[PDB]
């Protein structure tokens, strides 16, 4: 398969992706922008803090009706929320990427996430019955996630 922004040094860079992952696209994109650029161990600690509601994810683009929290001042934003399913799924994807770096023979504690991309997937259609005998769509919007780690230390 092909990715966007292919790495400059594929010897000291590993790759991991996931398709048709039933998550929310907006929460996944916001936690991907929160995780992008970090070290791998700091990133796993950040996702465990998101799961335990200790550090938040600032919602910067998809911030419609999102309540404010105190924890977003670490990032310099007002809105903030703790996407648990998103954090767990792209924590399992960092586990897969660390396994792929171990298979390639890379240094584990020197990996920095160079690239991450969250695309939309084909929507899963369902229905909801509303007033006056009408049926409206109820669409899951899952995401494709792909990321590259690079030895940068």
């Amino acid at each position: 398969v092909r990715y966007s922004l292919d790495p400059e040094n594929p010897t000291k860079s590993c790759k991991s992706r996931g398709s048709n992952l039933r998550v929310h696209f907006k929460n996944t994109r916001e936690t991907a922008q929160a995780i992008k650029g970090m070290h791998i161990r700091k990133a796993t600690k950040y996702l465990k803090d998101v799961t335990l509601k200790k550090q938040c994810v600032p919602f910067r683009r998809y911030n419609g009706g999102v309540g404010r929290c105190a924890q977003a001042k670490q990032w310099g934003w007002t809105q903030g929320r703790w996407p648990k399913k998103s954090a767990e799924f792209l924590l399992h994807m960092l586990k897969n990427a660390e396994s792929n770096a171990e298979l390639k023979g890379l240094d584990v504690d020197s990996l920095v996430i160079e690239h991450i991309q969250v695309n939309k997937a084909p929507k899963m259609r369902r229905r909801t019955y509303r007033a006056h005998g009408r049926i409206n769509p109820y669409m899951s919007s899952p995401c494709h996630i792909e990321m590259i780690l690079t030895e940068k230390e």
Binding site: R127, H132, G133, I135
Partner: peptide, 24 residues
């Protein structure tokens, strides 16, 4: 499951409804 049919025609506005009337 079958294809849902079009929303019925709600006889909502007319002589019978006093919720909004024009000058008459």
């Amino acid at each position: 499951d079958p294809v849902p049919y079009q929303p019925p025609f709600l006889c909502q506005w007319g002589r019978h409804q006093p919720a909004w009337k024009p000058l008459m």
